[PDB]
Design a binder for this molecule. Structure first.
Ligand SMILES: [Zn+2]
Ligand SMILES: [Zn+2]
Lengths: 70, 72
């Protein structure tokens, strides 16, 4: 289910991509007297993909990248 | 462990359950499918302001919206 292939930036050839976290919410389950969250349940919203080398970004990886099979 | 030392309580509600906003950070995709779906990811979330789960009393500091009770 892995190592089947790889996406590559259509502009620079990088195969390592980011995904912006747009927002979300944390359900704090435990905190300490000093005020630090120790246990939580996050529900992050994911956003546009980006290229680690050139920053080519879009909502869909397809526009910014191609699938190179191994 | 500090996991039962006590509880924070809203200075308006008395509620002990708080949220923390996610201002948003960056994720690091490590495995994506031919369909374009993320499998493995390393998220670097940036957290924001606490908000009471009832009041909505909110601040960047839990100490401004709540007080620490003590289980003793
Ligand atoms: Zn690129
Ligand atoms: Zn409250």
């Amino acid at each position: 289910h892995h190592h089947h292939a790889m996406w590559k930036c259509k502009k620079c050839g990088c195969d390592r991509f980011y995904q912006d976290i747009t927002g979300g919410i944390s359900e704090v389950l435990e905190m300490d007297k000093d005020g630090e969250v120790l246990d939580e349940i996050d529900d992050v919203e994911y956003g546009d993909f980006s290229c680690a080398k050139c920053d080519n970004s879009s909502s869909k990886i397809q526009e910014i990248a191609y699938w190179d099979e191994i």
